[PDB]
Design a protein around this ligand. Sequence first.
Ligand SMILES: CC1(C)S[C@@H]2[C@H](NC(=O)Cc3ccccc3)C(=O)N2[C@H]1C(=O)O
Ligand SMILES: [Ca+2]
Lengths: 206, 557
Amino acid sequence: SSSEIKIVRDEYGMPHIYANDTWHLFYGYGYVVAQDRLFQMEMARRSTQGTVAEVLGKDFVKFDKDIRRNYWPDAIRAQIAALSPEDMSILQGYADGMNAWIDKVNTNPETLLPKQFNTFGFTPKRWEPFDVAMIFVGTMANRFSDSTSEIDNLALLTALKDKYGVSQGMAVFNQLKWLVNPSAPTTIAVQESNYPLKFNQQNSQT
Amino acid sequence: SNMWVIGKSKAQDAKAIMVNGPQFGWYAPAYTYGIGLHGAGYDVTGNTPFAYPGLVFGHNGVISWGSTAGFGDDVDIFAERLSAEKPGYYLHNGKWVKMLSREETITVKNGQAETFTVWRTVHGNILQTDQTTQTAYAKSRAWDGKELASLLAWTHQMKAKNWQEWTQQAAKQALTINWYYADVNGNIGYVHTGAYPDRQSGHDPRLPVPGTGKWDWKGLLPFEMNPKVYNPQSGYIANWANSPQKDYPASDLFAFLWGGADRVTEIDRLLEQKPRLTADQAWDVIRQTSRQDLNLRLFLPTLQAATSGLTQSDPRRQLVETLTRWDGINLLNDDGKTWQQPGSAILNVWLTSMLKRTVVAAVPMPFDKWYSASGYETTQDGPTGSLNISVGAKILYEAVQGDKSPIPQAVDLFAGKPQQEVVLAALEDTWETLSKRYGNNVSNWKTPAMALTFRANNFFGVPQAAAEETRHQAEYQNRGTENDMIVFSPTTSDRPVLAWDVVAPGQSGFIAPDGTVDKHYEDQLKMYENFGRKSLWLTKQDVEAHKESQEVLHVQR
Ligand SMILES: CC1(C)S[C@@H]2[C@H](NC(=O)Cc3ccccc3)C(=O)N2[C@H]1C(=O)O
Ligand SMILES: [Ca+2]
């Protein structure tokens, strides 16, 4: 049946989803997720979008401000809007699945509402493709692939140049923060290949 | 995060073995989510962070996959030129270009709402400003505009059935992530995936560049450039956040280096120790690396050289001999609080003293503080993440390597002093510090072990559970937040693939309104502690035979 989604959990509660098309497959995924981790996912949504102060108060305002200053939601929505129907079905189905359970939770809260919601004083709302996308974007991209300390680095080099002079300071910066170290143990052995690009390490952009 | 993939040439009783240990910190409920998908072109099983549509750790019965952070430099800072007149604009390519901006209002529980403005240029969102020289810094990510493509690449890669189809998806993953491959035929592979900028000639990726236009990236480097290997001569693929490839540059983070001293060597020596490994032995590498002090191997030779000429009764020589007998593998005493050996405490105190005497002394304040951590610092709750060789320690290592180090020592960290003298003085501090605390009988030193805590706040520091849901594990283990292993063509099984993972505390974070915890709320927590694991099912037969519950939904879009 094209409309049928089967959910089978093993003896560790791990869900396996069986469905024919994409929207149904990820609808089933979001369903079981909303069953297992609703509160965690709600708080992750708020973390990745900077809406934590809404429910936890003043101490998270700085946090919320920082999250929003670190990305551009319109750009994310634009990428979602460009997705093929097939790729969109992933996010939409996933979002619809959660909502199917969230609706059931908010209809019979006295038995289905995760305790934490009562404790933290609020209830879950529905998700859209954007929310699902931002879970990934805020927890893998904006936090796990968004690293740089260039402003400090320039400050260190500047302090090293003042202390040891221009040439010596540049050379010591190359000693504390080298661009490459050929003795670095590598996942790929040298016999396999090496990296062809060599970058400038004299700060010639000044 | 660590990962080792054992290929056909080194697998025993199997063709390929993949053991992944992603390190995200520890959390309750579990950081990752177990999930099996069967339909719409998918047939997979495994677990994944925050239940992303795409499983970061799993397999489809034909290939398996995994990840660890790439730590390439995919982020540069552009210094935008501003003007007191025409606020909100910045000079780019000879013209004053209008910045992008948006209003944001932070609603606040039991507080006042706050609205502010976020700014963006062609280079990225604005960090800090500075209306003295009128400069604002824009953070430029090579993956900008590719967030969703990376999310979809992580999903579609699950459908691959060989190296070619898989690398096709790896090419679309724009974040800086190491991807790993293994399959039923014994093949294995690695790709340092990610979008990387094609920088102008002379652009030092460690320092900011002008945003006036002349330093704009030429574009992005092609997939050809991404470090990759398929069926390496070595017969294995091991990573623990170390360099992908010879001459490949690391992240610009001052606190992050790939150098001669790298924790990944701990995995290498265990995989190279034996010609072939079985599934259980490859798994056992988790336990071993979990307990392995990462500094003993790096500095013991220097410690030995410096104390080789001291007499029996010299205390400092006694401390080095203590370390010499030690295999660096920490184990708990029956008290479940202390370590059987004082090795790490000795190294910790010594190393801290060395850094203070060497790297820290040579660096102008307050930057000097950047190189003072020994890498053992922790709280009563234990490390928030993995243990690693500290940046200061890595610099020190190059210094004690002498000429065997390829890094020019522009300045002598030892300030003209004999290296032995400084090493000895630090051992003197170590003995004074430790003996005064534990007594002069080293053999009964019961030094505190690190503990581990599954935290109720997620990595952001935001509650994802109530405070009481936090779980404690006596023994800190420098291992993945979760561990999964896929074994292809196991010779003792009827199936062409076997897989295991551990998702602690458990699959479920649900607590009913009356406080009744779900049956799978904590049924993997002890298993995690004991280095145990549970089977991941893929086929309809295995899933059915192991079903506890079932449900069928009928829905149309
Ligand atoms: C910026 C980082 C997220 S990268 C590093 C480490 N992450 C890993 O070891 C593995 C990993 C990260 C993201 C996705 C998969 C694996 C981890 O934790 N680190 C963080 C840090 O430096 O504060
Ligand atoms: Ca950079």
